[PDB]
From a paper:
The influenza virus RdRp is a heterotrimer that includes the polymerase catalytic subunit (PB1), the ‘cap-binding’ subunit (PB2), and the endonuclease-containing (PA) subunit.
In regard to the binding conformations of similar analogs, we found that the co-crystal structures of inhibitors that differ only by a single atom type (Cl vs F, or CH2 vs O vs S) show very similar bound conformations to each other.
Numbering used by the authors: -3 to 53, 73 to 138, 141 to 195
Write the structure that this text describes.
């Protein structure tokens, strides 16, 4: 049963992001052919994590998301044993070598206030940065890590994705599936 959102995801995002999203869903036991809105969300958040990592200097960010669960936990062990930072209870998405903290990036369909609460509820010392499909962002202690142009590029891409879905009538189903 091939959905329209599955075919849109493969045309909307780059193949390396699509393949990483598939492996991430097959691990943890999910099907991109069925949980197709979730398939889109993983690709979206993966692309945001990659753009974020490209916003700083060359050696600034270590990327944790998009890895196998074991090697992602391997890299944070090495980070924490090199930096002397607390090992996070849950896997974060990035590490900032310049500001010496982990980052949990969020991409949300609701308003940025509510998700940060939920994200901070499950969190203690790692930095938190939320993006929305409506252009809003919220970061821990109002420190948005990157400069304005890099974040604005991420917001523009998010709104383009929402437009492309709406143009095919997939947005309403994607908005109310979170
Ligand atoms: O890394 C994360 N989870 C570890 C892998 O879990 C998986 C579970 C099922 C399938 C694939 C992976 C992590 N999870 C989450 C959220 C809220 C907490 C649990 N959750 C998920 O299950 C959904 O995943 C995401 C939701 C939106 C954007 C990116 C995501 F990935 N949001 C994040 O931003 C995030 O980075
Ligand atoms: Mn993650
Ligand atoms: Mn995240």
């Amino acid at each position: 049963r091939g959905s329209h959102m599955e075919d849109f995801v493969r045309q909307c995002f780059n193949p390396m992001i699509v393949e990483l999203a598939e492996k991430a869903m097959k691990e943890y036991g999910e099907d991109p052919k069925i949980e197709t809105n979730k398939f889109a969300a993983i690709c979206t958040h993966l692309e945001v994590c990659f753009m974020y990592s490209d916003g700083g200097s060359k050696h600034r960010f270590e990327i944790i998301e998009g890895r196998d669960r074991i090697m992602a936990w391997t890299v944070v062990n090495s980070i924490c044993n090199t930096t002397g930072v607390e090992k996070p209870k849950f896997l974060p998405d990035l590490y900032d070598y310049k500001e010496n903290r982990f980052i949990e990036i969020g991409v949300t369909r609701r308003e940025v206030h509510i998700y940060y609460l939920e994200k901070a509820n499950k969190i203690e010392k790692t930095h938190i940065h939320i993006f929305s499909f409506t252009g809003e962002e919220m970061a821990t202690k109002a420190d948005y890590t990157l400069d304005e142009e890099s974040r604005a590029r991420i917001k523009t891409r998010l709104f383009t994705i929402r437009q492309e879905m709406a143009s095919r009538s997939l947005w309403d189903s994607f908005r109310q599936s979170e």
